Structure formats: C-alpha cells, structure tokens
C-alpha cells in the first residue's frame, strides 16, 4: 500500500525495493506446508486455504493494478519480476482465476499466452 500510494519517490532504489520484494513474495515457502478426524483436519485445512487465497487475491488485485500502472509509467525494471510473480499467482488457479481476471481487464490474455509457453 505504501508502494502503491505513489508518495514514495520511485527510482532505481525503489526499483530494487520492488524487485527484491517480488522474489520475497514469489518464495516457495510463503505457502503453508498443510496444502503442500486427521483427514477431516486436512480437508478443513485446504478449505481454509481456498478461502484465504481468494481473500488474498481480492485484496491484492486493485493495488497490483495501481502499482503496475505507475511502474510501467516509470519504466521500472521490476516489471519482469511483476510478470514473474503474477504468473505463479496464475499457476495457483487455472480457470476460475481466468474468470476473476475477466472481471479484471488487459492482464489475462498475456497470462494464458505465457502459460502456453511454459507448457
């Protein structure tokens, strides 16, 4: 939110801030080991996992759109880290994220195209 405020001076320093926070966000270990009576506990763990990750997505997407807009406006070199992290966000969910990114605009088509390139 402090990044997407724009009150910060966005520069090469802020390029390094954004970029290394992107590989903080794109770490493998940021997700829980639970999704990586006891079978019922596993069941409720992954249902909790779907609801927290969809809450996380609906929180992040407006501020992602704002920060990517001002980031491409400044030609900040962390945009490759943007399209790095956002695509592992895209290999979380295959079709319902395409529906939520059909609610969003001008981001999905490049995402299916890179995903096709990854296969």
């Amino acid at each position: 939110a402090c990044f997407a405020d724009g009150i910060l001076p966005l520069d090469l320093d802020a390029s390094e801030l954004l970029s290394d926070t992107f590989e903080v966000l794109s770490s493998k270990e940021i997700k829980l080991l639970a999704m990586r009576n006891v079978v019922m506990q596993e069941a409720q763990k992954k249902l909790i996992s779907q609801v927290q990750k969809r809450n996380f997505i609906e929180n992040i997407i407006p501020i992602i759109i704002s920060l990517k807009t001002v980031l491409e406006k400044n030609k900040i070199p962390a945009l490759r880290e943007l399209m790095h992290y956002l695509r592992e966000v895209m290999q979380d969910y295959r079709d319902e994220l395409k529906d939520f990114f059909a609610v969003d605009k001008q981001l999905a088509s490049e995402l299916e195209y890179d995903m096709k390139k990854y296969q």
Partner: protein, 252 residues
Amino acid sequence: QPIRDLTKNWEDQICISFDEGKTTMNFIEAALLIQGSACVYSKKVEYLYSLVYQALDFISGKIIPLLPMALVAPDEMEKNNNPLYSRQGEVLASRKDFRMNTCVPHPRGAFMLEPEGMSPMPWQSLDPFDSLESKPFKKGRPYSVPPCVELQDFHQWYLRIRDWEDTVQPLLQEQEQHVPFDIHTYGDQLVSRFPQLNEWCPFAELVAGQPAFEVCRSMLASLQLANDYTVEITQQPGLEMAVDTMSLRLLT
C-alpha cells in the same frame, strides 16, 4: 443448495451456536440464516464450510549440536561461597558473576572461554526491456540569418429529412413569433371584446380577424373560464350546429 452437492462432491439433532456462544440455534435453522448472512458470497460460502466442518467434528466425536558450557548459569551456593565486597566492605556480587575467572590462558598470551575448538593462527533474440541513451527533445535555433547588406571570385569556380426540416422549421419559427398567451389577460381581453359584462354576443365575431392560433387560444381561454364555473358558455342545442355559436357570460 449447490454447496450441499459440493460437500457431497468431496464424499439434525445438534445445537450450533453462532458468534461467541451467545446465540443458540438448531442445525436446520443455523445453516439457513447463515445462507443469507451479511457477507460477500465468497465470504458467505467460507463461513458455510466452517460450519459443516465444526458440526462434522462433533458428530465424529460422539540435529541438536553440543551446547556451549558458558550458556549455563552456575549454582547459587557456589556464588554464596565466593562473594565479592566493596571498598566500604559491603558484599556487592559474587566472583562467578564475571567471566574473566573462566578465561583460559594461551602460550601466545590469548584468553578464550572454550579451549576446545580451533585455535587462532544466429537465431538468438534480443533481451527485452533494456534502457539505452534517449536524447531528449531540446528547442533552439540551428539557424542564422545574417543581413550583410541592407564580392565574388572566378578562379575558384574555374578550377426526406432535409425536406422534413424545410417543411417543419418555418412552422417552428412561426410558433416563436406566436403571441404570448396568459390565461387571465386573455380572459379579460375576451370579456372586453364583449360590449358589456354578462352580455350575449357571438364569440366567433369577437375572434373574427384573429389568426388561427389566436382563435384557438381564445377558445382555450373560453374553455378554461367555463371549466372554472366563473363564465358560462351559451351554445346552440345539438351536436354539429353548436359550432362557432358560443358566447361567454361572466357570472362571477
């Protein structure tokens, strides 16, 4: 209930308490008031799984390295056995409270806490998004105009919508220079057109010489004065011969 199938796509006598335990509810009542709860549909379905899991639980219910030795506090009786006192003679601390007593000499003269350990001695493509030198736009004159006046040498050189507008628009201007019509002033004017108040005289004669729109405004004023029960219209009895034979009689 699509979620009931979606619980079944995985694979009543119970009391469920919403919130913090204040409310008491039966399962058929609890699940159905929460199906219309004060959340977004994604949050509502989330709460609905948590209810199914909490109810189902109740239905089912019925490496280490060596430790450094200096990390251990010494025994209290030992510290009583060697106390350290002050210039005034009062006991201030113990001797084991400080670590130079546990320092170990070296042949070089060094002191370490742990003697155990190491002693000191053609189809490739461009990479995208590479900023290069962008020479910015700068404004100025590359040009010079010398007026030297207001000198040559030879040897150097020697070597129906339109119809609709035309039909209807003059009528629109004709409406714009229509006479301004106010109901009270026109009613008083039509009354003054009569020789005297409450006198029968042909109203067609009084509107004779007026244009068609003024005649229609006059009969509209007559109709309004008739409908307000103030002025009485006297027409000929019948249907078709009553035309142009009305007369205004100003009763009130």
